[PDB]
Amino acid sequence: STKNGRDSNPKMLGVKVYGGQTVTAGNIIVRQRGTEFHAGANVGMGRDHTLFATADGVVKFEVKGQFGRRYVKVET
Amino acid sequence: MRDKIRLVSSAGTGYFYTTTKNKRTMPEKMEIKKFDPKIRQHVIFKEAKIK
RNA sequence: GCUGGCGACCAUAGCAAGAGUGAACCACCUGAUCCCUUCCCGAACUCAGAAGUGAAACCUCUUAGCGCUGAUGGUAGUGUGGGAUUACCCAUGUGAGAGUAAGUCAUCGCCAGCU
RNA sequence: GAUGCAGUGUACCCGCGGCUAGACGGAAAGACCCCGUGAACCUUUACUGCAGCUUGACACUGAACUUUGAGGUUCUAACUCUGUCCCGUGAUCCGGGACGAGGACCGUGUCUGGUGGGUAGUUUGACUGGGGCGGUCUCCUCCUAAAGAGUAACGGAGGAGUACGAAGGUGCGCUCAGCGUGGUCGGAAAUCACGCGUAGAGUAUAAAGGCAAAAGCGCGCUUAACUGCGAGACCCACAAGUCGAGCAGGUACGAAAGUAGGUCUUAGUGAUCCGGUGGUUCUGUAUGGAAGGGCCAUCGCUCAACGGAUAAAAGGUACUCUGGGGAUAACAGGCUGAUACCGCCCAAGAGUUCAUAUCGACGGCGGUGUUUGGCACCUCGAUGUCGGCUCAUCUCAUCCUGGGGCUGAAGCAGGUCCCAAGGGUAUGGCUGUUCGCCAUUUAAAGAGGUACGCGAGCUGGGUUUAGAACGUCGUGA
RNA sequence: AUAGCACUCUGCAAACACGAAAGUGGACGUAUAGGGUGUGAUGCCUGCCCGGUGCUGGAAGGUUAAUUGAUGGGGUUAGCGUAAGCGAAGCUCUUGAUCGAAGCCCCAGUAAACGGCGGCCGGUCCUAAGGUAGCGAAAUUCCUUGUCGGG
RNA sequence: GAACCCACUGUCGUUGAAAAGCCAGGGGAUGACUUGUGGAUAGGGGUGAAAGGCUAAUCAAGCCUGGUGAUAGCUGGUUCUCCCCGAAAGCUAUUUAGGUAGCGCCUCGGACGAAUACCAUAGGGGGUAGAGCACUGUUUCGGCACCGAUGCAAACUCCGAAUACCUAUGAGUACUAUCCGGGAGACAGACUGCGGGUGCUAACGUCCGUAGUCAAGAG
RNA sequence: UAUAAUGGGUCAGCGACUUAUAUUCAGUAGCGAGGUUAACCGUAUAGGGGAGCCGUAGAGAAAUCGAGUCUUAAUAGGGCG
């Protein structure tokens, strides 16, 4: 008899809106367990590290800063 | 484990909150300021049996 | 042409070693009266000041020393069609990683002082 | 596992007497095995009723004297006699009468506690390389998972069924770990001071994704671990789950711009029904109230078989039965060849010396389809056998006889290898045996395939129905 | 099954059985009789255990039913109150003190009652107690075609 | 030891002379014996020197008639013709696993037309193949845990494709997409190639992803 | 599945999606902001019979309001119309 045989339910993480798409305020952009992407301009962060848009515009990804962090922002 | 308790408004409105508590580390009755929607003011709430 | 502040950028821009700067600015610097301060200490924070020094520190300059960047060519992998089954071959499209030649001791913007 | 398909060989048309190798021959919707939220009967400390037995209270049920509500003594008139006598009456039933022995007891009705396989109705999960035994059943993290999401196995590894009034909020402030020098006990390693390189420390707890405006570590003040909501999205069969700017009211911390709707995040959970507690400008069976119901808030689940059949449930059947399945096991066939058997390559060495006369370690490569196995493709509206008897047919990896090479072959014998399938190739004791051991023979008493050849050719000793007994297991069947 | 043996129940309107009852069998019998249970002529015999379940005998201690209904709390209205509210009696909803048997808990006996007669390396642990006579590879022995003797 | 009552062995018989027998042998045969006539016991009952035996060729609960056309998630069967379209054997839950329910896939009617798809161009995130040793582990040889060489990894990563996937614009081709309603079936799949787990890099083996064929398709 | 998986020896005759009620959808006809009767009476498929049913208004648990209503301190926001 094996001592294995368990696993957890899926969580459906990942990027929901890619670069170049238009969003409205409140749209969820990234679902993530940790902070792989950071919040840029017009982007807010939830209590579970979810990134969402706070204004209408176009999504844009970039790499910025002295630590080389990945940022996502919304251009109005 | 942790026991359940009610915090009852001292204004006499009957409003209450519910929470848990460690009886060993907290033998005394709990008292804390909270909002009371019945009178729309902050007042002191005191511990009581949850029954 | 120097000094200070605030940004763009985040190593071709960083570390390391060596050398300079006191007019102004900055830095150490004097003591602790009042404001304020240390689970103790005017060491840090703070106040009241210029008798000393550019020693340290911060800036500027030089060096390829460490680091970082990095081709061209080839190789591995791979979508579609065909031929084979120890995982290859042909046609067509695509194309790394590592390594080699080589490069680098940054580049810009706003304001205020001194020549 | 083919009379009927492909290739090929053979074969003029039709009877009669025999024979049983095949037509998976005929016969009985398999009885073995599994399944169905099928059946019957049996057992018990399975669940739940009832009969029977038993306890007390009330009624039938009365009187007179005593003692510390109860107990005692006495009586007769209720009531009992399957005791005697008389009458109906010609009668061991029955009724009436007279006696006698008992007597408010016994017994019966209603209510009530106990006991209750005597009897009755039922329950006793699923997954599963057949079923049983074992393990598992809900949630979180990683891999499998093929660079969006999702993705199975009785695949490989680990965790959860909590904790905290601060370990929450805010303002201000601070950086770990390691090594090296010195410095009392003090050292491998307690604390102190100074250096070197450096995230390897820490984050209540498993792993992963993260963490300098530190999300890590301290101090002061505090309760936003608030009320009413909520544009817009993620995920999704449903029921559920997740993120959220912003608006109003009341707060906390900051000089202020501001931050705060619990904790770095992802586990720490349970629908509906039925009840309990607080509040309420709801309802209220003629009317006024009330009881009860509604609405808002909250409490009672290892319902863990975790979408939870009931408030309440275990076993046996060889005494068995029905509906089904070759969807699924035991025999034989099939695929495979781990295992089994046979052959070959290399060669440490053994063989007085000499690897190869004969053996040959450590390793390597194949063949066959006689073994033990793996799978579940055929057959469950039946393919019905362990051994013996009778009768066979084929293979060659040859037991004897025939022909040869080498030899550590003097001769006689022997060893090893090559060619060769024409013929031949024991009787008994023991046991159901196949096998094996033993006795005595023979030139020899070979190894295998043929549904482990052959039971519509024979037998029926073994296994495997119903009877009975022993050992052992069970309370028992 | 049996003759024989043992245990146990039954005092007569017997125990027991059939039947809803009336009644009937037991029996026109009476403990040398009748029912139930086990063993199985005869010979020699029949060891230990009462912790468990059962049965028998005690106890009046604890627990407990129907019945009973002391207290306490509500609903309603005469009235008293500016109002809020208070509010007897009478009806009614509920709460439930006290009394209360058998059984069970407790204490003994009983195995020809149902049952049991050990472990781990002489010792030790544990039991209610650890197998007496007799027999033994047996209708019981897996290993096993045990070993030896006879045929 | 005859009659009479039984039923131990064997042959035959087995669509029999016979729905239990014949033949040759066998046991008891004054007793707990055999037998005629007439009576009693009735179905959860009877009777049983006890085999679950017997109770009219029927017994782990007789036969007959009623409830009754019991129920059966199971097996079988389902009858004339032509035209059009055309599946699935998956996910989730289930005392559920060969049943069923919601969704996915089919068909018919209505609404509404480019909102759809193929391809080109542009924008975008990734951590697989490959590779590497910078972390975590593991490996060989030297020098003194470090230093120089040297290998390996599903649960290692300083790196890192091709394809797939999301969005916007656009030519050409095509009854495309979407919404609202009526009716379903199906929830046992198989093989082959490619990427894998398990198994022995066995199986016409088993479990997933992806494409083709069969299923439902002849030549 | 030629299957060595099931069923049928052959012929003739018989043999299996019905009936009643309720409800929803689609066709078709009458009337149309309206439509329609049931039991019953009736020498009776006529004619009477308007009780009742469907449509015409939602929101809210409900009392209550009503083109609005519920939640709320809110005329804010939001849900159903």
PDB file of all heavy atoms in Angstrom, chain F residues 178-187:
ATOM      1  P     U F 178     -20.963  31.046 -31.480  1.00  0.00           P
ATOM      2  OP1   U F 178     -20.197  30.558 -30.311  1.00  0.00           O
ATOM      3  OP2   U F 178     -21.804  30.097 -32.248  1.00  0.00           O
ATOM      4  O5'   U F 178     -21.896  32.241 -30.995  1.00  0.00           O
ATOM      5  C5'   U F 178     -21.367  33.333 -30.258  1.00  0.00           C
ATOM      6  C4'   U F 178     -22.384  34.435 -30.098  1.00  0.00           C
ATOM      7  O4'   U F 178     -22.782  34.933 -31.401  1.00  0.00           O
ATOM      8  C3'   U F 178     -23.696  34.044 -29.439  1.00  0.00           C
ATOM      9  O3'   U F 178     -23.610  33.990 -28.027  1.00  0.00           O
ATOM     10  C2'   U F 178     -24.653  35.112 -29.947  1.00  0.00           C
ATOM     11  O2'   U F 178     -24.487  36.319 -29.220  1.00  0.00           O
ATOM     12  C1'   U F 178     -24.136  35.336 -31.368  1.00  0.00           C
ATOM     13  N1    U F 178     -24.896  34.561 -32.377  1.00  0.00           N
ATOM     14  C2    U F 178     -26.194  34.945 -32.653  1.00  0.00           C
ATOM     15  O2    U F 178     -26.751  35.877 -32.103  1.00  0.00           O
ATOM     16  N3    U F 178     -26.835  34.191 -33.597  1.00  0.00           N
ATOM     17  C4    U F 178     -26.327  33.118 -34.289  1.00  0.00           C
ATOM     18  O4    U F 178     -27.038  32.544 -35.113  1.00  0.00           O
ATOM     19  C5    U F 178     -24.980  32.782 -33.955  1.00  0.00           C
ATOM     20  C6    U F 178     -24.328  33.499 -33.037  1.00  0.00           C
ATOM     21  P     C F 179     -24.560  32.996 -27.197  1.00  0.00           P
ATOM     22  OP1   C F 179     -24.111  32.998 -25.784  1.00  0.00           O
ATOM     23  OP2   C F 179     -24.639  31.713 -27.932  1.00  0.00           O
ATOM     24  O5'   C F 179     -25.992  33.690 -27.256  1.00  0.00           O
ATOM     25  C5'   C F 179     -26.219  34.948 -26.641  1.00  0.00           C
ATOM     26  C4'   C F 179     -27.606  35.466 -26.926  1.00  0.00           C
ATOM     27  O4'   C F 179     -27.766  35.697 -28.349  1.00  0.00           O
ATOM     28  C3'   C F 179     -28.755  34.536 -26.578  1.00  0.00           C
ATOM     29  O3'   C F 179     -29.083  34.547 -25.202  1.00  0.00           O
ATOM     30  C2'   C F 179     -29.874  35.050 -27.469  1.00  0.00           C
ATOM     31  O2'   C F 179     -30.449  36.225 -26.918  1.00  0.00           O
ATOM     32  C1'   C F 179     -29.103  35.443 -28.727  1.00  0.00           C
ATOM     33  N1    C F 179     -29.114  34.379 -29.758  1.00  0.00           N
ATOM     34  C2    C F 179     -30.289  34.127 -30.472  1.00  0.00           C
ATOM     35  O2    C F 179     -31.296  34.795 -30.208  1.00  0.00           O
ATOM     36  N3    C F 179     -30.295  33.162 -31.419  1.00  0.00           N
ATOM     37  C4    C F 179     -29.186  32.469 -31.669  1.00  0.00           C
ATOM     38  N4    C F 179     -29.227  31.527 -32.610  1.00  0.00           N
ATOM     39  C5    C F 179     -27.976  32.709 -30.961  1.00  0.00           C
ATOM     40  C6    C F 179     -27.984  33.665 -30.028  1.00  0.00           C
ATOM     41  P     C F 180     -29.736  33.251 -24.518  1.00  0.00           P
ATOM     42  OP1   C F 180     -29.828  33.497 -23.061  1.00  0.00           O
ATOM     43  OP2   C F 180     -29.009  32.056 -25.010  1.00  0.00           O
ATOM     44  O5'   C F 180     -31.214  33.203 -25.109  1.00  0.00           O
ATOM     45  C5'   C F 180     -32.147  34.237 -24.832  1.00  0.00           C
ATOM     46  C4'   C F 180     -33.484  33.963 -25.473  1.00  0.00           C
ATOM     47  O4'   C F 180     -33.368  34.039 -26.917  1.00  0.00           O
ATOM     48  C3'   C F 180     -34.073  32.586 -25.224  1.00  0.00           C
ATOM     49  O3'   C F 180     -34.701  32.476 -23.959  1.00  0.00           O
ATOM     50  C2'   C F 180     -35.026  32.417 -26.401  1.00  0.00           C
ATOM     51  O2'   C F 180     -36.232  33.128 -26.174  1.00  0.00           O
ATOM     52  C1'   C F 180     -34.258  33.121 -27.520  1.00  0.00           C
ATOM     53  N1    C F 180     -33.481  32.175 -28.353  1.00  0.00           N
ATOM     54  C2    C F 180     -34.128  31.491 -29.385  1.00  0.00           C
ATOM     55  O2    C F 180     -35.334  31.699 -29.565  1.00  0.00           O
ATOM     56  N3    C F 180     -33.422  30.628 -30.150  1.00  0.00           N
ATOM     57  C4    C F 180     -32.125  30.441 -29.914  1.00  0.00           C
ATOM     58  N4    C F 180     -31.457  29.583 -30.686  1.00  0.00           N
ATOM     59  C5    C F 180     -31.443  31.125 -28.871  1.00  0.00           C
ATOM     60  C6    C F 180     -32.150  31.975 -28.126  1.00  0.00           C
ATOM     61  P     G F 181     -34.991  31.033 -23.319  1.00  0.00           P
ATOM     62  OP1   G F 181     -35.322  31.221 -21.887  1.00  0.00           O
ATOM     63  OP2   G F 181     -33.887  30.121 -23.698  1.00  0.00           O
ATOM     64  O5'   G F 181     -36.315  30.552 -24.059  1.00  0.00           O
ATOM     65  C5'   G F 181     -36.654  29.178 -24.130  1.00  0.00           C
ATOM     66  C4'   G F 181     -37.578  28.909 -25.287  1.00  0.00           C
ATOM     67  O4'   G F 181     -37.044  29.525 -26.489  1.00  0.00           O
ATOM     68  C3'   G F 181     -37.752  27.451 -25.672  1.00  0.00           C
ATOM     69  O3'   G F 181     -38.674  26.758 -24.853  1.00  0.00           O
ATOM     70  C2'   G F 181     -38.173  27.548 -27.126  1.00  0.00           C
ATOM     71  O2'   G F 181     -39.529  27.955 -27.228  1.00  0.00           O
ATOM     72  C1'   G F 181     -37.291  28.697 -27.603  1.00  0.00           C
ATOM     73  N9    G F 181     -35.994  28.206 -28.104  1.00  0.00           N
ATOM     74  C8    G F 181     -34.751  28.497 -27.608  1.00  0.00           C
ATOM     75  N7    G F 181     -33.789  27.903 -28.253  1.00  0.00           N
ATOM     76  C5    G F 181     -34.435  27.173 -29.235  1.00  0.00           C
ATOM     77  C6    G F 181     -33.919  26.325 -30.246  1.00  0.00           C
ATOM     78  O6    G F 181     -32.744  26.039 -30.485  1.00  0.00           O
ATOM     79  N1    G F 181     -34.931  25.784 -31.029  1.00  0.00           N
ATOM     80  C2    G F 181     -36.268  26.026 -30.862  1.00  0.00           C
ATOM     81  N2    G F 181     -37.115  25.426 -31.703  1.00  0.00           N
ATOM     82  N3    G F 181     -36.757  26.813 -29.928  1.00  0.00           N
ATOM     83  C4    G F 181     -35.795  27.351 -29.156  1.00  0.00           C
ATOM     84  P     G F 182     -38.352  25.260 -24.379  1.00  0.00           P
ATOM     85  OP1   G F 182     -39.203  24.949 -23.209  1.00  0.00           O
ATOM     86  OP2   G F 182     -36.883  25.128 -24.267  1.00  0.00           O
ATOM     87  O5'   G F 182     -38.827  24.357 -25.600  1.00  0.00           O
ATOM     88  C5'   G F 182     -40.195  24.281 -25.965  1.00  0.00           C
ATOM     89  C4'   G F 182     -40.413  23.325 -27.110  1.00  0.00           C
ATOM     90  O4'   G F 182     -39.835  23.865 -28.328  1.00  0.00           O
ATOM     91  C3'   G F 182     -39.765  21.958 -26.987  1.00  0.00           C
ATOM     92  O3'   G F 182     -40.453  21.066 -26.132  1.00  0.00           O
ATOM     93  C2'   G F 182     -39.711  21.504 -28.435  1.00  0.00           C
ATOM     94  O2'   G F 182     -40.998  21.111 -28.884  1.00  0.00           O
ATOM     95  C1'   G F 182     -39.339  22.810 -29.127  1.00  0.00           C
ATOM     96  N9    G F 182     -37.875  22.940 -29.228  1.00  0.00           N
ATOM     97  C8    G F 182     -37.048  23.759 -28.506  1.00  0.00           C
ATOM     98  N7    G F 182     -35.792  23.618 -28.821  1.00  0.00           N
ATOM     99  C5    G F 182     -35.793  22.640 -29.802  1.00  0.00           C
ATOM    100  C6    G F 182     -34.727  22.063 -30.530  1.00  0.00           C
ATOM    101  O6    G F 182     -33.524  22.308 -30.451  1.00  0.00           O
ATOM    102  N1    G F 182     -35.174  21.104 -31.427  1.00  0.00           N
ATOM    103  C2    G F 182     -36.481  20.745 -31.604  1.00  0.00           C
ATOM    104  N2    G F 182     -36.720  19.800 -32.520  1.00  0.00           N
ATOM    105  N3    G F 182     -37.485  21.275 -30.937  1.00  0.00           N
ATOM    106  C4    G F 182     -37.069  22.208 -30.060  1.00  0.00           C
ATOM    107  P     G F 183     -39.622  20.050 -25.208  1.00  0.00           P
ATOM    108  OP1   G F 183     -40.582  19.318 -24.356  1.00  0.00           O
ATOM    109  OP2   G F 183     -38.521  20.804 -24.571  1.00  0.00           O
ATOM    110  O5'   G F 183     -38.977  19.019 -26.237  1.00  0.00           O
ATOM    111  C5'   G F 183     -39.798  18.168 -27.021  1.00  0.00           C
ATOM    112  C4'   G F 183     -39.003  17.337 -27.999  1.00  0.00           C
ATOM    113  O4'   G F 183     -38.317  18.185 -28.959  1.00  0.00           O
ATOM    114  C3'   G F 183     -37.888  16.479 -27.431  1.00  0.00           C
ATOM    115  O3'   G F 183     -38.339  15.313 -26.768  1.00  0.00           O
ATOM    116  C2'   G F 183     -37.053  16.202 -28.671  1.00  0.00           C
ATOM    117  O2'   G F 183     -37.700  15.254 -29.504  1.00  0.00           O
ATOM    118  C1'   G F 183     -37.113  17.562 -29.365  1.00  0.00           C
ATOM    119  N9    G F 183     -35.974  18.404 -28.957  1.00  0.00           N
ATOM    120  C8    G F 183     -35.981  19.408 -28.025  1.00  0.00           C
ATOM    121  N7    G F 183     -34.816  19.959 -27.861  1.00  0.00           N
ATOM    122  C5    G F 183     -33.981  19.269 -28.725  1.00  0.00           C
ATOM    123  C6    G F 183     -32.595  19.422 -28.981  1.00  0.00           C
ATOM    124  O6    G F 183     -31.811  20.229 -28.476  1.00  0.00           O
ATOM    125  N1    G F 183     -32.137  18.524 -29.931  1.00  0.00           N
ATOM    126  C2    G F 183     -32.915  17.589 -30.559  1.00  0.00           C
ATOM    127  N2    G F 183     -32.309  16.800 -31.451  1.00  0.00           N
ATOM    128  N3    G F 183     -34.210  17.437 -30.329  1.00  0.00           N
ATOM    129  C4    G F 183     -34.678  18.303 -29.407  1.00  0.00           C
ATOM    130  P     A F 184     -37.876  15.018 -25.257  1.00  0.00           P
ATOM    131  OP1   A F 184     -38.977  14.327 -24.555  1.00  0.00           O
ATOM    132  OP2   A F 184     -37.320  16.266 -24.690  1.00  0.00           O
ATOM    133  O5'   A F 184     -36.679  13.980 -25.403  1.00  0.00           O
ATOM    134  C5'   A F 184     -35.350  14.420 -25.637  1.00  0.00           C
ATOM    135  C4'   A F 184     -34.798  13.827 -26.907  1.00  0.00           C
ATOM    136  O4'   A F 184     -34.189  14.869 -27.709  1.00  0.00           O
ATOM    137  C3'   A F 184     -33.698  12.791 -26.751  1.00  0.00           C
ATOM    138  O3'   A F 184     -34.197  11.499 -26.447  1.00  0.00           O
ATOM    139  C2'   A F 184     -32.993  12.857 -28.098  1.00  0.00           C
ATOM    140  O2'   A F 184     -33.726  12.140 -29.078  1.00  0.00           O
ATOM    141  C1'   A F 184     -33.095  14.346 -28.424  1.00  0.00           C
ATOM    142  N9    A F 184     -31.885  15.093 -28.041  1.00  0.00           N
ATOM    143  C8    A F 184     -31.756  16.027 -27.049  1.00  0.00           C
ATOM    144  N7    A F 184     -30.554  16.529 -26.953  1.00  0.00           N
ATOM    145  C5    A F 184     -29.846  15.887 -27.953  1.00  0.00           C
ATOM    146  C6    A F 184     -28.511  15.976 -28.374  1.00  0.00           C
ATOM    147  N6    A F 184     -27.613  16.784 -27.818  1.00  0.00           N
ATOM    148  N1    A F 184     -28.124  15.198 -29.404  1.00  0.00           N
ATOM    149  C2    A F 184     -29.026  14.387 -29.966  1.00  0.00           C
ATOM    150  N3    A F 184     -30.304  14.215 -29.659  1.00  0.00           N
ATOM    151  C4    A F 184     -30.655  15.002 -28.634  1.00  0.00           C
ATOM    152  P     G F 185     -33.581  10.644 -25.236  1.00  0.00           P
ATOM    153  OP1   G F 185     -34.509   9.527 -24.959  1.00  0.00           O
ATOM    154  OP2   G F 185     -33.225  11.572 -24.140  1.00  0.00           O
ATOM    155  O5'   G F 185     -32.225  10.040 -25.815  1.00  0.00           O
ATOM    156  C5'   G F 185     -32.225   9.050 -26.833  1.00  0.00           C
ATOM    157  C4'   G F 185     -30.983   9.137 -27.684  1.00  0.00           C
ATOM    158  O4'   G F 185     -30.759  10.519 -28.059  1.00  0.00           O
ATOM    159  C3'   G F 185     -29.678   8.717 -27.023  1.00  0.00           C
ATOM    160  O3'   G F 185     -29.466   7.315 -27.052  1.00  0.00           O
ATOM    161  C2'   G F 185     -28.637   9.496 -27.813  1.00  0.00           C
ATOM    162  O2'   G F 185     -28.374   8.865 -29.055  1.00  0.00           O
ATOM    163  C1'   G F 185     -29.379  10.797 -28.090  1.00  0.00           C
ATOM    164  N9    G F 185     -29.079  11.834 -27.086  1.00  0.00           N
ATOM    165  C8    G F 185     -29.907  12.323 -26.110  1.00  0.00           C
ATOM    166  N7    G F 185     -29.348  13.244 -25.382  1.00  0.00           N
ATOM    167  C5    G F 185     -28.075  13.377 -25.909  1.00  0.00           C
ATOM    168  C6    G F 185     -26.996  14.218 -25.533  1.00  0.00           C
ATOM    169  O6    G F 185     -26.924  15.072 -24.652  1.00  0.00           O
ATOM    170  N1    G F 185     -25.890  14.038 -26.347  1.00  0.00           N
ATOM    171  C2    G F 185     -25.819  13.136 -27.366  1.00  0.00           C
ATOM    172  N2    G F 185     -24.649  13.136 -28.008  1.00  0.00           N
ATOM    173  N3    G F 185     -26.806  12.343 -27.733  1.00  0.00           N
ATOM    174  C4    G F 185     -27.897  12.515 -26.965  1.00  0.00           C
ATOM    175  P     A F 186     -28.756   6.564 -25.824  1.00  0.00           P
ATOM    176  OP1   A F 186     -28.544   5.156 -26.215  1.00  0.00           O
ATOM    177  OP2   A F 186     -29.510   6.859 -24.584  1.00  0.00           O
ATOM    178  O5'   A F 186     -27.333   7.262 -25.698  1.00  0.00           O
ATOM    179  C5'   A F 186     -26.283   6.994 -26.615  1.00  0.00           C
ATOM    180  C4'   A F 186     -25.075   7.842 -26.311  1.00  0.00           C
ATOM    181  O4'   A F 186     -25.467   9.239 -26.310  1.00  0.00           O
ATOM    182  C3'   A F 186     -24.449   7.632 -24.941  1.00  0.00           C
ATOM    183  O3'   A F 186     -23.549   6.540 -24.898  1.00  0.00           O
ATOM    184  C2'   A F 186     -23.789   8.973 -24.663  1.00  0.00           C
ATOM    185  O2'   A F 186     -22.574   9.087 -25.382  1.00  0.00           O
ATOM    186  C1'   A F 186     -24.796   9.932 -25.282  1.00  0.00           C
ATOM    187  N9    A F 186     -25.804  10.388 -24.307  1.00  0.00           N
ATOM    188  C8    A F 186     -27.120  10.019 -24.263  1.00  0.00           C
ATOM    189  N7    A F 186     -27.798  10.580 -23.303  1.00  0.00           N
ATOM    190  C5    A F 186     -26.869  11.381 -22.669  1.00  0.00           C
ATOM    191  C6    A F 186     -26.968  12.237 -21.564  1.00  0.00           C
ATOM    192  N6    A F 186     -28.095  12.434 -20.884  1.00  0.00           N
ATOM    193  N1    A F 186     -25.858  12.892 -21.177  1.00  0.00           N
ATOM    194  C2    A F 186     -24.731  12.689 -21.863  1.00  0.00           C
ATOM    195  N3    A F 186     -24.511  11.912 -22.915  1.00  0.00           N
ATOM    196  C4    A F 186     -25.634  11.276 -23.276  1.00  0.00           C
ATOM    197  P     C F 187     -23.452   5.624 -23.585  1.00  0.00           P
ATOM    198  OP1   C F 187     -22.523   4.512 -23.886  1.00  0.00           O
ATOM    199  OP2   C F 187     -24.830   5.318 -23.140  1.00  0.00           O
ATOM    200  O5'   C F 187     -22.765   6.563 -22.497  1.00  0.00           O
ATOM    201  C5'   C F 187     -21.438   7.029 -22.678  1.00  0.00           C
ATOM    202  C4'   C F 187     -21.026   8.052 -21.645  1.00  0.00           C
ATOM    203  O4'   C F 187     -22.002   9.114 -21.547  1.00  0.00           O
ATOM    204  C3'   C F 187     -20.867   7.576 -20.211  1.00  0.00           C
ATOM    205  O3'   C F 187     -19.635   6.910 -20.001  1.00  0.00           O
ATOM    206  C2'   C F 187     -20.958   8.874 -19.418  1.00  0.00           C
ATOM    207  O2'   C F 187     -19.695   9.520 -19.380  1.00  0.00           O
ATOM    208  C1'   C F 187     -21.907   9.719 -20.277  1.00  0.00           C
ATOM    209  N1    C F 187     -23.250   9.893 -19.674  1.00  0.00           N
ATOM    210  C2    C F 187     -23.356  10.820 -18.636  1.00  0.00           C
ATOM    211  O2    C F 187     -22.347  11.432 -18.273  1.00  0.00           O
ATOM    212  N3    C F 187     -24.544  11.040 -18.042  1.00  0.00           N
ATOM    213  C4    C F 187     -25.616  10.373 -18.450  1.00  0.00           C
ATOM    214  N4    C F 187     -26.765  10.629 -17.825  1.00  0.00           N
ATOM    215  C5    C F 187     -25.547   9.424 -19.511  1.00  0.00           C
ATOM    216  C6    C F 187     -24.357   9.215 -20.092  1.00  0.00           C
TER     217        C F 187
END
